[PDB]
């Protein structure tokens, strides 16, 4: 699709068999989802942004369907204010910025 | 133009006549620049993201040219590791997400 930016670019995703809402976020290196369980192994990681650093759980090789497009990659789980799809998965679905 | 997301989408902007590097950020409501010494009136604001909130200075009606595309609006100044162009200005330059 083509998405304008008058509103936050929120879309539905499927992860771990569940539906969630998430923000398509070109300013994110990584994909960060609110606290939940995902299948498999995880390890601690720290990530930063605007307010500083947080601790997250790093899950690798997680399938995520993003407005019907498939990705498989790292998903970080932790106390993010909003679920965000970062560049690690946006690249997989072919997302670009255009102006 | 078209910007891919293999690396951070850093572009040249001009603010106060000066060229700077900033991230085109669809996950940002606002534009956050570290330009601590603009003249003009400002007011205090707090903005949040992954690590919590920070204090910023809110400057209104500031011209910001993004890759040769002129914009004008609110710029928030505060300590950030990367200058970010948020949706308040991205919409002015007709930027969309596409996949």
């Amino acid at each position: 699709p083509q998405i304008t930016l008058w509103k936050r670019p929120l879309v539905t995703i499927r992860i771990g068999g569940q539906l969630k809402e998430a923000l398509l976020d070109t300013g994110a290196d990584d994909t960060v989802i609110e606290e939940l369980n995902l299948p498999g192994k995880w390890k601690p990681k720290l990530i930063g942004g605007i307010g500083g650093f947080i601790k997250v759980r790093q899950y690798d090789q997680i399938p995520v369907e993003i407005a019907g497009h498939k990705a498989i990659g790292t998903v970080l789980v932790g106390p993010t204010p909003v679920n965000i799809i970062g560049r690690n998965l946006l690249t997989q679905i072919g997302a670009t910025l255009n102006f | 133009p078209q910007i891919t997301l293999w690396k951070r989408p850093l572009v040249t902007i001009r603010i106060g006549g000066n060229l700077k590097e900033a991230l085109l950020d669809t996950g940002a409501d606002d534009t956050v620049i570290e330009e601590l010494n603009l003249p003009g009136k400002w007011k205090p604001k707090l903005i949040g993201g992954i690590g919590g909130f920070i204090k910023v200075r809110q400057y209104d009606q500031i011209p910001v040219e993004i890759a040769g595309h002129k914009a004008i609006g609110t710029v928030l100044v505060g300590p950030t590791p990367v200058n970010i162009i948020g949706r308040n200005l991205l919409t002015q330059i007709g930027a969309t997400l596409n996949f």
């Binding site: 204010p81 | 940002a28 993201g49």
Partner: peptide, 6 residues
């Protein structure tokens, strides 16, 4: 990792 503003 840096991850972006509300």
């Amino acid at each position: 990792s840096l991850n972006x503003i509300x």
